[PDB]
Amino acid sequence: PALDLIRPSVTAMRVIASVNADFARELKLPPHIRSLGLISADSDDVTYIAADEATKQAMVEVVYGRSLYAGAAHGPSPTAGEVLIMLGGPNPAEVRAGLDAMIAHIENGAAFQWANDAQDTAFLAHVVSRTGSYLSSTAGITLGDPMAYLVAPPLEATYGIDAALKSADVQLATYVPPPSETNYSAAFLTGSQAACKAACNAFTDAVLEIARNPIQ
């Protein structure tokens, strides 16, 4: 039913203890990063948040992060999900700690929710109370500060973003207009933590409203 959590899952994972020199150059890895952890999951935004959480729980940084066209439900294989994260580290131990943190946060952390009882529409309104290096890489987001991670289908997202910015003391840090590779739209809002929560609640109310009466 509406507001129930969609539980994402890790679909594939591997650790490259020592990345090949040639491939390392093509990947433009810093000198210190010669160990690489690969992970794929069926939910892109939840995974992006987990990767960022990983850069707080270990000596890792995101080397690569991209989502798939049309999402997991139209993926080329079960191992693909709709994302691939490559975490880089100085050694296999740090990489595994990072990956462990990613697994924990993909299975029991930030999660999309059903916008309706029909369960054909999904959205994400999540507060990252303390951003790590990854999310703070984005222009407008400072390392350690909080943020609201808002994701929804094109129209729900546009309406909801406007509705969030009017509900709390927050600023638009990054706006990803529709479509993303997955055909969703996304926004990263900044400000106080309590304010970000507020924004998330207003976002949710907007998406649910459209879910109930999509055409007024």
Added chain:
Amino acid sequence: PALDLIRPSVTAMRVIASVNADFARELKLPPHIRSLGLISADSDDVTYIAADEATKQAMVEVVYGRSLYAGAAHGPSPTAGEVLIMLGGPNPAEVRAGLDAMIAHIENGAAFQWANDAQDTAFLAHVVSRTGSYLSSTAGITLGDPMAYLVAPPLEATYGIDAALKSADVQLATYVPPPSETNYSAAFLTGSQAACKAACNAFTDAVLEIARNPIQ
């Protein structure tokens, strides 16, 4: 059966009477445009034509217009369809008039047609007799002049475009090679109205030919 109209439908709609300042800046809205109408439908090109028709029937202009990867049949939700149009206006009344025009033209206007009796292949060959601001935004298209809107799968489209340019007194204004986000290919042809109709008929004949015997 072949040549039957595919009837598209509006999947979601909303009006933002007064857009948030911050969001307005990120959207780069002109000073006069502070009211915003959002609409999503299951057919991208038909919707693009409706939006353009709207800029003739009201004091609106298209702020944003983009289609989804792999189309409506592989959309993330029923409200997404495969397009989102954001119409901008000076006030909610103009925006609603624009949206009303969009609805009318999405339900009873330009429409794709089945290329075969199997109904697994679709195309669009439509004459926009008088283009509005939106379509005329495209390089080569003058405000008010006519044009042929041709859309078909990669090969059908390439063959048909060539076939249209040989059938009537027309020029290639814009060519969108495959794939578009929806995996179709498209062309906007220019010239006299009667000539555009001619181009549409030759386009159709080419697509049907391939539909009957795809491999000669």
Added chain:
Amino acid sequence: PALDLIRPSVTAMRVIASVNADFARELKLPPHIRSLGLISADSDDVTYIAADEATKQAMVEVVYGRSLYAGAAHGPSPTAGEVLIMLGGPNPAEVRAGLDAMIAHIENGAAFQWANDAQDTAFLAHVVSRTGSYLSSTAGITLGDPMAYLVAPPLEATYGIDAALKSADVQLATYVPPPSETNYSAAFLTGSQAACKAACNAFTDAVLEIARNPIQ
């Protein structure tokens, strides 16, 4: 079962004996190329290899080559497959010879293989012993030299590329990170022919390993 060949098929084909002048200009065709062969198939990489083989078997060159978003299984129509190749030639005879070579190599040539018995995961590890103009267009690849064509889902591909570069005397010529329009990842490796075969075998072993135990 695992390692069985996926047999691709041509989905649509046509020859334009004499391309329209206007369209020819928009396509930026060289003066000598005024005949054009169009072909679409359900497998993009196999088709890219066939097109390249065609530039060896006839006086043709690839005018256009692009794949579709989310692949054949989520294509807009059966004629679309997931690729469109436009071969350009000086006359219809050369174009038809090129197309004949493309058909033969799409039906009985380079072919993806199932990574698992479930047959939900596919990969490509193929040695092009003598590259033609098309593949050698890519920076790092010399006309006539050999190469390994490696393709797999995001994680399988990353792991396998690293694994290939460690298995044989080869260099990374081109790396296409995930996702491609089809949501796969790809690599073109260079070096001796025997070495390329080696790389293909190590690639395959890596993809199969992940297929058996995707999460270690």
